[PDB]
Amino acid sequence: GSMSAPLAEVDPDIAELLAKELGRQRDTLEMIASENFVPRAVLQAQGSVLTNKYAEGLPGRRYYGGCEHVDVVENLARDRAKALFGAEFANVQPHSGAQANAAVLHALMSPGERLLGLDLANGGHLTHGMRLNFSGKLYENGFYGVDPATHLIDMDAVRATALEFRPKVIIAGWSAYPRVLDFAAFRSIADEVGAKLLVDMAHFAGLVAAGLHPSPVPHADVVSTTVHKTLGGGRSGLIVGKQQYAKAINSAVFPGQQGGPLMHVIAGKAVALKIAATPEFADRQRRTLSGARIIADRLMAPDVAKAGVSVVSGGTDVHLVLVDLRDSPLDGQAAEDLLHEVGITVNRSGLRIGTPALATRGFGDTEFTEVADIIATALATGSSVDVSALKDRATRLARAFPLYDGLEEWSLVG
Amino acid sequence: GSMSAPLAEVDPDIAELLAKELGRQRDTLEMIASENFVPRAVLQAQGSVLTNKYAEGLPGRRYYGGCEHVDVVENLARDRAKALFGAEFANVQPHSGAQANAAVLHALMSPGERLLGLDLANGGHLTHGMRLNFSGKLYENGFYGVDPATHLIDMDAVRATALEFRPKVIIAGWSAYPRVLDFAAFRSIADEVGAKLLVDMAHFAGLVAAGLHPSPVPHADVVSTTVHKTLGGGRSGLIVGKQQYAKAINSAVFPGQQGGPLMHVIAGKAVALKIAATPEFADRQRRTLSGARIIADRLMAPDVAKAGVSVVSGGTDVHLVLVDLRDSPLDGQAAEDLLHEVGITVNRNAVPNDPRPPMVTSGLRIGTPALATRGFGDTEFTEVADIIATALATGSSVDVSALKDRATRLARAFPLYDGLEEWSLVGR
Numbered sequence: 001g002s003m004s005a006p007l008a009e010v011d012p013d014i015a016e017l018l019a020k021e022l023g024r025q026r027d028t029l030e031m032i033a034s035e036n037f038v039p040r041a042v043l044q045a046q047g048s049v050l051t052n053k054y055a056e057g058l059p060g061r062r063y064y065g066g067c068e069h070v071d072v073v074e075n076l077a078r079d080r081a082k083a084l085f086g087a088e089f090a091n092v093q094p095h096s097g098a099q100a101n102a103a104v105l106h107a108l109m110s111p112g113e114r115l116l117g118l119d120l121a122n123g124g125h126l127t128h129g130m131r132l133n134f135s136g137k138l139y140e141n142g143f144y145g146v147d148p149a150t151h152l153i154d155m156d157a158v159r160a161t162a163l164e165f166r167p168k169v170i171i172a173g174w175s176a177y178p179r180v181l182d183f184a185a186f187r188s189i190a191d192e193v194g195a196k197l198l199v200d201m202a203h204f205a206g207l208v209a210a211g212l213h214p215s216p217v218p219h220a221d222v223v224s225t226t227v228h229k230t231l232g233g234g235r236s237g238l239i240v241g242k243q244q245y246a247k248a249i250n251s252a253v254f255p256g257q258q259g260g261p262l263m264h265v266i267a268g269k270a271v272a273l274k275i276a277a278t279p280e281f282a283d284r285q286r287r288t289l290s291g292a293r294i295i296a297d298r299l300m301a302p303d304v305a306k307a308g309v310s311v312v313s314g315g316t317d318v319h320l321v322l323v324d325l326r327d328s329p330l331d332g333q334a335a336e337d338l339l340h341e342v343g344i345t346v347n348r349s350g351l352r353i354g355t356p357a358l359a360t361r362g363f364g365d366t367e368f369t370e371v372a373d374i375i376a377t378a379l380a381t382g383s384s385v386d387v388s389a390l391k392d393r394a395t396r397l398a399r400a401f402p403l404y405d406g407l408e409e410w411s412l413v414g
Numbered sequence: 415g416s417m418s419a420p421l422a423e424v425d426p427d428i429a430e431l432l433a434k435e436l437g438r439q440r441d442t443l444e445m446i447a448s449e450n451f452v453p454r455a456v457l458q459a460q461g462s463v464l465t466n467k468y469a470e471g472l473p474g475r476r477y478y479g480g481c482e483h484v485d486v487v488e489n490l491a492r493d494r495a496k497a498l499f500g501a502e503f504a505n506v507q508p509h510s511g512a513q514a515n516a517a518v519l520h521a522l523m524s525p526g527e528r529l530l531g532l533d534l535a536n537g538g539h540l541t542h543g544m545r546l547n548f549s550g551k552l553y554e555n556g557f558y559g560v561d562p563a564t565h566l567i568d569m570d571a572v573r574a575t576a577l578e579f580r581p582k583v584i585i586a587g588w589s590a591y592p593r594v595l596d597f598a599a600f601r602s603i604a605d606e607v608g609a610k611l612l613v614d615m616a617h618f619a620g621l622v623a624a625g626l627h628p629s630p631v632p633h634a635d636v637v638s639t640t641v642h643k644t645l646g647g648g649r650s651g652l653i654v655g656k657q658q659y660a661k662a663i664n665s666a667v668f669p670g671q672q673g674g675p676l677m678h679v680i681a682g683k684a685v686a687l688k689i690a691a692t693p694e695f696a697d698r699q700r701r702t703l704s705g706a707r708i709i710a711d712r713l714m715a716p717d718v719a720k721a722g723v724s725v726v727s728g729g730t731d732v733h734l735v736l737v738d739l740r741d742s743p744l745d746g747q748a749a750e751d752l753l754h755e756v757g758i759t760v761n762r763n764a765v766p767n768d769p770r771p772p773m774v775t776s777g778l779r780i781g782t783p784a785l786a787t788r789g790f791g792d793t794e795f796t797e798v799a800d801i802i803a804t805a806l807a808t809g810s811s812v813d814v815s816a817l818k819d820r821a822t823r824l825a826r827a828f829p830l831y832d833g834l835e836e837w838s839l840v841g842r
């Protein structure tokens with residue numbers, strides 16, 4: 001019967017589609033700033049029989065019996081998260097980054113109260129106040145932005161807005177910003193007006209883990225994150241913070257927002273948190289940051305500047321480069337389509353270019369120099385662009401750094 | 415590099431705990447009614463490289479490049495759900511049963527508006543209006559229950575409550591009820607008072623798929639479910655319903671409630687929906703139902719009655735049995751602990767007008783889906799029923815050793831996941 005039959009026998013169309021997606025990941029150059037590649041050991045945990053266990057509640061205080069082994073798993077994930085980030089408390093049950101943020105706002109505020117965050121047009125996430133999301137539907141929203149001249153967040157301007165609006169919760173965090181936030185200034189402003197401070201570090205958490213971006217943990221009431229993105233793990237969420245919020249946050253995740261947690265995915269969170277403390281992971285983060293600096297420099301060279309293309313803030317200190325196309329012949333969709341022709345996946349008069357996934361695959365400075373030159377030539381040279389010559393150079397790079405070499409022979413366990 | 419190193423090398427403590435949990439599943443008899451066992455093909459989908467893809471939006475309308483293959487995967491899951499259940503639209507993105515219900519309420523009502531559902535004390539779920547869940551925090555709540563004599567939902571009483579309370583949304587659905595809901599009566603009441611009708615079929619979806627429980631789909635505006643529980647798939651949610659509600663429900667899932675979907679888990683949903691249309695799966699549901707009737711019949715016998723034990727509603731028509739213990743020496747927690755000693759996993763459950771506190775109770779909920787998946791039929795269910803009845807009826811003379819030996823004999827005769835240690839991530 002079908003309980004022990006391979007996927008190839010049970011569902012031939014899904015088996016073929018898994019093979020096609022693996023091929024696409026191997027053949028293309030992935031430069032979406034929010035994406036990465038999980039290690040073999042995380043695939044194994046996500047494919048485990050822990051999916052079968054119902055574990056509503058917390059370790060040692062569950063609805064049902066038989067949780068002895070999954071309770072040790074959840075405690076390894078909590079205790080590794082506290083140690084890696086230097087936090088007082090952790091909850092490792094959120095299903096996603098969005099579900100982590102819904103639980104934090106449930107714990108710290110009530111419907112109708114005031115929420116202050118970074119504007120969508122200026123680099124914020126949809127969970128920081130967008131009108132159709134829970135963050136906009138339930139709460140009264142105010143926003144801060146970036147200085148129009150420097151393109152940096154001006155903390156004197158944030159201060160004046162907070163004193164006027166008097167928010168209950170202030171969010172620091174972003175989906176598209178190219179520099180380092182001042183967490184000590186955010187703490188000072190929240191204290192003045194009696195607000196709680198949430199930092200949403202989803203994009204930059206792996207930089208924090210390796211010691212290459214300043215930590216928000218000393219300064220924040222609560223910190224939310226994805227375990228995917230720069231942290232390099234399986235698709236899910238996580239919360240850490242000060243001890244005084246432990247009961248508020250636990251009760252908001254369950255039974256506030258969720259039912260049963262995904263215990264196979266929590267096992268993978270413990271694995272990713274162990275990898276994130278290693279010297280190998282720290283070097284990978286350094287190759288990420290050096291690649292982003294190499295691309296930003298190449299796009300500020302005379303040929304690109306003359307075509308009307310500019311780099312937002314004049315550089316980067318993080319894992320991505322933000323590009324403004326409004327004075328060039330290209331719009332965002334046209335630039336995205338042209339890069340697809342030469343084998344590169346990015347996202348959109350703006351364009352965002354990221355380096356985490358290529359660093360994980362093994363690219364260093366020589367390789368990022370070649371990738372930057374391919375992009376610059378496409379954006380600068382207009383009608384005279386040789387798509388075919390640029391595609392062959394991209395496929396040469398991909399072929400030289402194999403992805404998931406040997407996956408076709410790997411076991412579920414052992 | 416650690417990118418290609420096995421789990422046993424990278425994290426020996428976690429590898430060891432995976433092997434201990436597999437052994438616990440093999441050695442016990444699982445009878446929690448919300449539990450089941452996924453097939454090999456679903457383990458392989460959930461362990462796939464599809465975890466790496468960002469895919470916010472819907473097929474053909476995404477916010478990221480490179481989604482050509484994951485768009486085909488999502489459309490196979492949507493099309494198989496519509497065909498299996500006879501529904502006009504499907505959304506296959508919800509992360510869980512709770513997340514499916516949060517999106518439905520976001521689409522159909524506004525904060526402060528009125529919600530009517532089955533009480534927790536009478537077998538409802540916490541997402542049907544419990545005070546400290548979203549369903550109680552955001553909305554004004556009213557409840558219906560079961561009759562104190564018959565233990566059934568009385569639709570004349572549900573109608574009277576709906577006429578007085580005038581809800582915006584009525585929920586029909588349960589976590590612990592032993593009989594068949596009257597969906598045509600719920601539609602009539604909703605139409606009378608101008609309410610929308612949500613059916614939450616999480617517990618009984620696999621019975622509906624096999625044609626062995628009447629379908630809510632012709633009668634409901636929207637239907638929510640888990641893909642785990644009787645449907646037999648990986649841990650996740652699903653929504654199906656009338657085309658009238660498609661645009662609002664899609665917008666409520668994203669950007670209303672969620673961000674990126676879990677594409678590896680959605681591949682596994684497509685696999686579980688294909689299995690659920692097969693004759694093999696229909697036979698498994700027939701064995702689930704026949705096994706539960708055998709357990710109820712054995713408990714309704716002179717030895718068990720004389721010990722102070724009865725069956726709620728005097729029987730069952732679904733995948734579970736509700737036991738009433740209040741005239742016996744055992745409270746619900748005590749009975750749950752005794753059965754664990756003899757190798758069987760169940761959970762405590764509140765009875766009608768229960769005299770004990772809600773965290774202790776005077777009852778049990780006993781389920782058959784997980785053991786039917788493992789291969790049990792009528793012969794095996796007759797033996798487990800006798801083990802349970804003997805434990806509950808013999809008082810201080812119970813022989814735990816003799817009963818535990820009978821349970822482990824059944825576990826060894828029906829191996830679970832035999833050969834898993836040799837199976838590959840991809841291929842055969």
Ligand SMILES: [Mg+2]
Pocket residue numbers: 522523524
């Ligand atoms: Mg309305």
